[PDB]
Copies of this chain bind each other. A is one copy, B any other.
């Protein structure tokens, strides 16, 4: 019921996003001078919502709403919109961009993880709805591509990427692990788990020099959330106690202080609204592995962070083209 206002708002934002062409930002590599075209031509599906990765998870937001909150949503409009987007022809256009060797490394790893999350959501919806089964088949090729790219790249990673931006390794791998397990892709699952262990198992008593001025993710929290899915419960509970040993004393203080957002009209600083949302998302996930006191403390901390940001997700397009997805992630965490 509190979700009703949210679902309506998230529906409006995401439906506007996926078709809104301008303004836009491309991060595009090429070895042919003719390979410089409008996003609508380069990305037949994901040309809107300011950039490719934001468009992908704007689509995820609509699929998640359709699966679990359809009674609060303009379901028929959403279905019409996703039908015209997820055609075979448009999906082949995206895959043709992805498979071009001149575009190697495109959207790694944020777009990769988010697309696997979108594919996961469509496949879960397809158990419940016949229209989603066509979408899942039409987007299968792109998801297989990213699965292959993860398998090729992860063995090359001697080091992780820790920064709380879209390059964050833990965020992408968290979604990729959920997808791997749903598909029963044992090789992808093992690759993620071993990579996570290699990078992170010796981490303890984290300093947490965060936030940095352009982050929408917490390095220490996103890492912990990935390890909460990689490790077994009791090992993670043990690891987490050594990871951030003074949480019950609200230390480090930065994790219990919602971040300041000095200028929402600057694209980089506007990420800090997302950080307050994603902190709440991560704090809620981690709360399920804590003792009674720390569990309530982290959930109260999450609410404080969520409340600092939720009212600003529609202040301008630099925020509205993506914040709704993280607001839903934070709201959707099953608390136990």
Contact = CB atoms under 8 A, between A and B. Distances in A.
Interface of A: 21-33, 36-38, 102, 104-105, 108, 153, 156-163, 165, 167, 169, 203, 206-207, 209, 211-214, 259-260, 262-263, 266-269
B23 A26 contact: no
10 contacts: A22-B31, A22-B32, A23-B30, A25-B27, A26-B36, A36-B36, A156-B269, A159-B213, A161-B213, A162-B212
B33 A38 contact: yes
Given A31-B23, A33-B21, A33-B38, A213 B267 contact: no
A23 B31 CA distance: 4
B24 A29 contact: yes
Nearest to A163: B163
Contact of A105 (B30, B163, B169, B266): B266
Oligomer: number of copies: 2
Contacts of A104: 266-267
A5 to B, nearest CB: 30
Contacts of A26: 26-29, 36
A158 B258 CA distance: 13
A37 B38 contact: no
Nearest to A23: B31
B36 A25 contact: no
Given A26-B36, A159-B212, 11 more contacts: A21-B33, A22-B31, A22-B32, A26-B26, A28-B28, A33-B38, A156-B263, A158-B259, A158-B262, A159-B213, A163-B165
Contacts of A158: 213, 259-260, 262
